[PDB]
Amino acid sequence: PPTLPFHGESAYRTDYVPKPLPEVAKPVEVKLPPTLPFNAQSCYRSEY
């Protein structure tokens, strides 16, 4: 008589394989608004 060869693979042996790592490369590139150039052009030079 033959031996029924043991096929069997547990939960811990089956149901996860090493996943590919998540592809993350994205910073928050913020274009700076340039400082709005200032003429609240003062009193002395403004009127006299």
């Binding site: 910073p27 928050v28 913020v30 700076l32 608004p33 340039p34 400082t35 709005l36 200032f38 609240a40």
Partner: protein, 426 residues
């Protein structure tokens, strides 16, 4: 000559103030390595309020980072604009404060408070005269409510002259998380009434309310609603940071908004705000900022200003504008909407004008007001507190680590009388 020292406590506190240092940086041209790009005299002449030198030209923020976990302070450091803060000013703590007010205040936070007080004494006392402290925390967790108020108590006795402005985040209970929100909220309020000069009440639901019915966002994230808070935090200290036609100060706000020392809980808001397909549809004038600075939804606390009265109010306008309109519009809201304005103070309005508008915009304005409708926030937490309290709810954590029963009844007393004191002037 005057300095604000920012201390941020909690997961909410660290993330909000990380956006605050991000928006103060690009208001000041600071690159996230400390270098300064863009040429302007006015963007560095009053940068000592929030930054110090480092004998390498590096402008370093006055940040006193705090949370009882190596958690969100790792994400603040690893994220953008995270290299600015000193690694020394990153007091960690490894034991953990699990949303429990007594953890941060009594039994785990009392062994790290002696180090963050050492840090803030090294960084704030080492100057000629500091203007005050700015504290950012949420009264919903265990770190912000527990450790935050513990430092608030120690600072007010070491410096019983300086202004502590606290951008507290009250637990908004309509939609929220953690089951111990009323316990952490009420156990902190009966401390903020005594040893806190200004408390700006912020609720998360109102931040979603702006993010849904004003900005028309798709998915309002925590970063977006932390950006709106940092708008108000920068706008209040605008005159302290830039010149203007009518300069102000945090003490000018305190003396013009606190009729009696216990009543100092303000509704904050900020809106030259608009949706995505409407900034090219909406104008920009002083009446238009005015009508979106009183109305219903620009408030960052979930308290309707129509359900009450304004004891006193203030308006921090910013940018180039005529001084006639900034006076006439505060008159116009005063006499048209007179029911929502108290009479035993006549002419309840402060206006104040910055000359430098925020980045991109042409003019902005922030509201801070002492509306008596703040009673409906303390009432909306009291009716949840007494519900849990009658059958001795999640409490063996609080009592087991060194709180007697009298502390909880004393918590109910000083917050019930706060609502009653607001009743006498409504």
């Amino acid at each position: 000559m005057r300095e604000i020292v920012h201390v941020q406590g909690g997961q909410c506190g660290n993330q909000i103030g990380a956006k605050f240092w991000e928006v103060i940086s690009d208001e000041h041209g600071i690159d996230p390595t400390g270098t300064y790009c863009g040429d302007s005299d006015l963007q560095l002449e009053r940068i000592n309020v929030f930054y110090n030198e480092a004998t390498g030209g590096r402008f370093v923020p006055r940040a006193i980072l705090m949370d009882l976990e190596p958690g969100t302070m790792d994400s603040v450091r690893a994220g953008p604009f995270g290299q600015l803060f000193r690694p020394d000013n990153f007091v960690f703590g490894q034991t953990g404060a699990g949303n429990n007010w007594a953890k941060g205040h009594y039994t785990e936070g009392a062994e790290l408070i002696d180090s963050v007080l050492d840090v803030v004494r090294k960084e704030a006392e080492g100057c000629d005269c500091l203007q005050g402290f700015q504290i950012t925390h949420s009264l919903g967790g265990g770190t912000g409510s527990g450790m935050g108020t513990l430092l608030i108590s120690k600072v007010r006795e070491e410096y019983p002259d300086r202004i502590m402005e606290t951008f507290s985040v009250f637990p908004s209970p309509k939609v929220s998380d953690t089951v111990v929100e009323p316990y952490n909220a009420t156990l902190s309020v009966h401390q903020l009434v005594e040893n806190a000069d200004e408390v700006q009440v912020i609720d998360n639901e109102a931040l979603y309310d702006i993010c849904f019915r004003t900005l028309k966002l798709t998915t309002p994230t925590y970063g977006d609603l932390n950006h709106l808070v940092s708008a108000a935090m920068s706008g209040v200290t605008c005159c302290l940071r830039f010149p203007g036609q009518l300069n102000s100060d945090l003490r000018k706000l305190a003396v013009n908004l606190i009729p009696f020392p216990r009543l100092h809980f303000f509704l904050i808001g900020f809106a030259p705000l608009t949706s995505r397909g409407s900034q090219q549809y909406r104008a920009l004038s002083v009446p238009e900022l005015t009508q979106q600075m009183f109305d219903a939804k620009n408030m960052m606390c979930a308290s309707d200003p129509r359900h009450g009265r304004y004891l006193t109010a203030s308006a921090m306008f910013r940018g180039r504008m005529s001084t006639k309109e900034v006076d006439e519009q505060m008159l116009n809201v005063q006499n048209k909407n007179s029911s929502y304005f108290v009479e035993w103070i006549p002419n309840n309005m402060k206006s104040s004008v910055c000359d430098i508008p925020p980045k991109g915009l042409k003019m902005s304005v922030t509201f801070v007001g002492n509306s008596t409708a703040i009673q409906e926030m303390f009432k909306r937490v009291s009716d949840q507190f007494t519900a849990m309290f009658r059958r001795k709810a999640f409490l063996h954590w609080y009592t087991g680590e060194g709180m007697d029963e009298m502390e909880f009844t004393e918590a109910e007393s000083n917050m019930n009388d706060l609502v009653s004191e607001y009743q006498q002037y409504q």
